Amino acid sequence: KKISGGSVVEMQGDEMTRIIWELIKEKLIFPYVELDLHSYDLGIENRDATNDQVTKDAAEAIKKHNVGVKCATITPDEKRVEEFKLKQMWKSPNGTIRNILGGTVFREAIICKNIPRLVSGWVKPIIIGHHARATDFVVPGPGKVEITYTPSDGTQKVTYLVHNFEEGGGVAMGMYNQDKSIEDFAHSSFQMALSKGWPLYLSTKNTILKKYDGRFKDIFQEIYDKQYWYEHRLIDDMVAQAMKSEGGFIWACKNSLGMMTSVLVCPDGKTVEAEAAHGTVTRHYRMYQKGQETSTNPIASIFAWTRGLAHRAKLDNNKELAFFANALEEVSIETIEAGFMTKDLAACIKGLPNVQRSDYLNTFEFMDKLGENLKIKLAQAK
Amino acid sequence: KKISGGSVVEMQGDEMTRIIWELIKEKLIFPYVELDLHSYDLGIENRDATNDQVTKDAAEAIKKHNVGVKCATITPDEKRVEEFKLKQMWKSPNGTIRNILGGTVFREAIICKNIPRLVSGWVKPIIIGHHRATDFVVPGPGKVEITYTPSDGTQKVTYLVHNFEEGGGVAMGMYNQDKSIEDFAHSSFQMALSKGWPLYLSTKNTILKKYDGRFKDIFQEIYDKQYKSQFEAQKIWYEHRLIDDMVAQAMKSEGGFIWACKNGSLGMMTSVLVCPDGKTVEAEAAHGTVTRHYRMYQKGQETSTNPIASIFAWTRGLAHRAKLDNNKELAFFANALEEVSIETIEAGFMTKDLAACIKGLPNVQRSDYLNTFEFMDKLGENLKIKLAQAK
Ligand SMILES: NC(=O)c1ccc[n+]([C@@H]2O[C@H](COP(=O)([O-])OP(=O)(O)OC[C@H]3O[C@@H](n4cnc5c(N)ncnc54)[C@H](OP(=O)(O)O)[C@@H]3O)[C@@H](O)[C@H]2O)c1
Numbered sequence: 001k002k003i004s005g006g007s008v009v010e011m012q013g014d015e016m017t018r019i020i021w022e023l024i025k026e027k028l029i030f031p032y033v034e035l036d037l038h039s040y041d042l043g044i045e046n047r048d049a050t051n052d053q054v055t056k057d058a059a060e061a062i063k064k065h066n067v068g069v070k071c072a073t074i075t076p077d078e079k080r081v082e083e084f085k086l087k088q089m090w091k092s093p094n095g096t097i098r099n100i101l102g103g104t105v106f107r108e109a110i111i112c113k114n115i116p117r118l119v120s121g122w123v124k125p126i127i128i129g130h131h132a133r134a135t136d137f138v139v140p141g142p143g144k145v146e147i148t149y150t151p152s153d154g155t156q157k158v159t160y161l162v163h164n165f166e167e168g169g170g171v172a173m174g175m176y177n178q179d180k181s182i183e184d185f186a187h188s189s190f191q192m193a194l195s196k197g198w199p200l201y202l203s204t205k206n207t208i209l210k211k212y213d214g215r216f217k218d219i220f221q222e223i224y225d226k227q228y229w230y231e232h233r234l235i236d237d238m239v240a241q242a243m244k245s246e247g248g249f250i251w252a253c254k255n256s257l258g259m260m261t262s263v264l265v266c267p268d269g270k271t272v273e274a275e276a277a278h279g280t281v282t283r284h285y286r287m288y289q290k291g292q293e294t295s296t297n298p299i300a301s302i303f304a305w306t307r308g309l310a311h312r313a314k315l316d317n318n319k320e321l322a323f324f325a326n327a328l329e330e331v332s333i334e335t336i337e338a339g340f341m342t343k344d345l346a347a348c349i350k351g352l353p354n355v356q357r358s359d360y361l362n363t364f365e366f367m368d369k370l371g372e373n374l375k376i377k378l379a380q381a382k
Numbered sequence: 383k384k385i386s387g388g389s390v391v392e393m394q395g396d397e398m399t400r401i402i403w404e405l406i407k408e409k410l411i412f413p414y415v416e417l418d419l420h421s422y423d424l425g426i427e428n429r430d431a432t433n434d435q436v437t438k439d440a441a442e443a444i445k446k447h448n449v450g451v452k453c454a455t456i457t458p459d460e461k462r463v464e465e466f467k468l469k470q471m472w473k474s475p476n477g478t479i480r481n482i483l484g485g486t487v488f489r490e491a492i493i494c495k496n497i498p499r500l501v502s503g504w505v506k507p508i509i510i511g512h513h514r515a516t517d518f519v520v521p522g523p524g525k526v527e528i529t530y531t532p533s534d535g536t537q538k539v540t541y542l543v544h545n546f547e548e549g550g551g552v553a554m555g556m557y558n559q560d561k562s563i564e565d566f567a568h569s570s571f572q573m574a575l576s577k578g579w580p581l582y583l584s585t586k587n588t589i590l591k592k593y594d595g596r597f598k599d600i601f602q603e604i605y606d607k608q609y610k611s612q613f614e615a616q617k618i619w620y621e622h623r624l625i626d627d628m629v630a631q632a633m634k635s636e637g638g639f640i641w642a643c644k645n646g647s648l649g650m651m652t653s654v655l656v657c658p659d660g661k662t663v664e665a666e667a668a669h670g671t672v673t674r675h676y677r678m679y680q681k682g683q684e685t686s687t688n689p690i691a692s693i694f695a696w697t698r699g700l701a702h703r704a705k706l707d708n709n710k711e712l713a714f715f716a717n718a719l720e721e722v723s724i725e726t727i728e729a730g731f732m733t734k735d736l737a738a739c740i741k742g743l744p745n746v747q748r749s750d751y752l753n754t755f756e757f758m759d760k761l762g763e764n765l766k767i768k769l770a771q772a773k
């Protein structure tokens with residue numbers, strides 16, 4: 001009856017996104033898909049109770065099962081330490097997860113025909129990638145700061161003057177990048193393309209950091225010929241090319257939030273972690289706690305699930321799951337395009353002072369409209 | 383009858399901006415203000431004829447007279463060397479001027495009510511100020527180290543940057559003198575007090591604990607010793623914020639702050655070089671010479687070039703001159719010219735770039751905008767009326 005979805009790592013989160021995450025599972029996922037679900041509770045109280053061990057176990061499960069879908073989580077600050085009486089200022093779960101997995105983060109805004117964009121010409125989305133270290137120190141007083149390279153065979157020594165501090169002190173730092181990290185960025189970028197069926201654009205300073213940025217340009221061109229369209233451009237020339245076009249390209253960059261998605265793509269081409277690019281929407285959660293009506297956009301959170309499920313389906317050659325993930329993305333866009341949307345989107349169209357209650361749906365009404373539309377779409381498909 | 387404006391250093395430039403610059407002087411400045419004008423011709427042919435000596439003399443004149451107003455200039459590349467048969471690839475005049483003066487460049491987009499922004503909440507502008515490196519290819523395995531050798535002969539300090547054990551890559555060294563950080567802090571505090579807005583410094587001091595920590599410590603020290611009382615008197619403040627926390631607050635805010643960063647139509651983008659002394663200022667448009675429009679102008683074709691950024695170079699320069707000289711009539715004139723410029727656009731009279739921001743470039747009709755000369759004439763008519771009404 002229901003689709004056999006296979007192995008998925010799910011991470012529960014905090015505040016308004018936690019409410020939305022449960023609604024998505026109950027209304028959009030669980031009525032259609034059965035999963036061998038590896039669920040980790042990354043809610044702040046559980047991270048505190050387990051001394052953050054839950055976060056490390058979730059990252060290891062993503063590494064083992066290749067598919068991670070994560071709800072937004074609170075990153076503690078002093079105010080959060082007091083609010084929850086935390087044992088310590090726990091590090092960001094996203095930072096912990098990224099450190100364990102590695103990879104490149106790709107960000108993509110979901111586009112709807114009736115929702116204004118930065119450039120009206122944008123019909124197809126733009127997927128921006130950045131690869132995801134330094135030795136800094138105080139220069140106590142006058143003297144030379146030099147950076148040297150000694151090849152391991154001892155045949156040469158190259159010394160570069162960083163600066164001769166003559167009047168006083170300051171600060172200095174040394175930075176590096178290994179060819180393997182640049183290679184991993186290139187792979188993830190060509191493999192983000194091919195999967196999406198779009199062209200790739202690499203942008204660098206190149207005119208300023210000629211040797212550092214030149215190596216990225218050279219490694220990308222080399223990998224494009226040996227193992228794989230693709231084109232390089234300067235930052236200034238690139239933003240101009242983005243001001244034109246219908247969009248629909250991957251932009252590897254070396255240097256409403258409710259519609260912003262994020263995907264971590266590991267160099268292996270096997271592991272993916274998807275999530276909303278926004279936070280826990282604390283202000284809406286405070287309204288919910290006071291009995292006030294909320295209108296929180298679930299699109300970014302739904303697309304974490306669809307990107308995760310589409311990846312799972314690709315790994316397992318599961319056609320029914322691949323169809324479901326795509327159908328849920330289309331239903332989400334189509335619902336908004338038919339005029340049914342949350343307040344943030346009504347405000348993008350009308351301007352916040354001109355938004356009336358009849359222009360939007362509350363959190364629960366929007367989720368119910370998506371559920372009704374999804375039921376219809378899948379019934380007609382079979 | 384005309385305002386006695388005093389001592390101003392003016393730098394003439396190239397292509398479309400050179401045409402606009404002359405129109406501004408003839409229609410907006412010279413009918414109202416008399417200046418002891420120190421004019422330098424930084425047009426590309428004159429920089430070539432003088433072996434760039436004109437650029438160095440202009441920078442020394444700004445140092446001496448404290449007020450510089452500069453027109454956009456061509457920075458030569460190989461194509462420009464061929465076009466003008468240049469003796470050499472002269473360095474950017476902006477780079478030469480900045481090296482002689484020092485100081486921090488503050489950028490600000492001019493806001494009009496009927497012109498769409500990035501964040502609709504931004505009612506007040508955001509003024510962003512920014513603060514060299516030695517990079518190289520690491521051809522294969524080996525050690526990259528960064529060393530500090532005291533000038534007094536005490537023990538050399540060696541830090542390992544990375545030991546490349548397989549394959550190559552790239553490495554770089556970067557630095558900052560305490561004096562450059564102190565200058566950045568002073569120019570930033572001077573900017574915020576002049577504008578009457580709060581100041582934020584953003585760094586990644588949690589990652590670059592020593593490097594960015596020094597910026598955070600020097601700004602806080604200079605604030606506590608020399609500017610905290612003055613900031614309180616104007617009900618404004620200074621705060622350090624991490625870059626991640628800073629971008630999030632910038633979207634939430636209605637604008638109206640100075641942002642010192644440790645790291646829309648170009649026709650509306652202004653730039654001001656603020657020297658740490660609080661006395662010297664160099665103002666200019668943040669855009670270039672608008673070569674594409676200049677090519678149309680050379681062919682006798684109608685152009686619609688936005689002069690706002692160029693007008694604001696003159697108004698920022700004149701407002702600073704007026705502040706230094708306690709010249710109330712000049713202070714009023716500079717403010718009136720800024721207001722006339724914004725008000726003209728807000729009344730529906732604008733160049734094509736702005737009509738395109740409203741309607742979208744494919745939907746712009748000739749009746750939606752004014753050409754370069756029509757727009758300058760409308761500003762001249764509005765300026766005359768405003769100053770008459772002012773008494
Ligand atoms: N990936 C992550 O886990 C992640 C990322 C960022 C922040 N955070 C955490 O999230 C918490 C809250 O951070 P924050 O309030 O600064 O950022 P945020 O949750 O992204 O929310 C900022 C504002 O953006 C709007 N917004 C964001 N997501 C929305 C959605 N889905 N639907 C409708 N409007 C939406 C709301 O604007 P209006 O208020 O005008 O309605 C909201 O108050 C913090 O504890 C922070 O650590 C986590």
Ligand SMILES: NC(=O)c1ccc[n+]([C@@H]2O[C@H](COP(=O)([O-])OP(=O)(O)OC[C@H]3O[C@@H](n4cnc5c(N)ncnc54)[C@H](OP(=O)(O)O)[C@@H]3O)[C@@H](O)[C@H]2O)c1
Pocket residue numbers: 453454455456457458476648649666667668669670671672673674675686687688689691735
């Ligand atoms: N501060 C300076 O002295 C400075 C700064 C930057 C560059 N440059 C020099 O400027 C020359 C030309 O550079 P560029 O064409 O790359 O840059 P640019 O002059 O800033 O012009 C780029 C484009 O932006 C638009 N634009 C810029 N200023 C405008 C204005 N005032 N009104 C209307 N539209 C405006 C035009 O767009 P559309 O074509 O779409 O109409 C123009 O073609 C080069 O020689 C460069 O060295 C000098």
